Ligand binder design. Structure first.
Ligand SMILES: [Zn+2]
Length: 55
């Protein structure tokens, strides 16, 4: 016989893979991104310091 295969994943749980800060059933993506906690990661992940030569 046959067991069966999978052809579609689902699981957009409220989390921030970027800051690894899994939001709580209550918390929300907004409340997060709207907190230094997140911003910081967004400032470091790339950096604040400007580039040598500007465009
Ligand atoms: Zn975040």
């Amino acid at each position: 016989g046959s067991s069966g295969s999978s052809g579609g994943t689902d699981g957009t749980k409220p989390e921030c893979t970027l800051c690894g800060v899994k939001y709580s059933a209550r918390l929300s993506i907004r409340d997060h991104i709207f907190s230094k906690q997140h911003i910081s990661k967004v400032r470091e992940t790339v950096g604040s310091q400007l580039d040598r030569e500007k465009d």
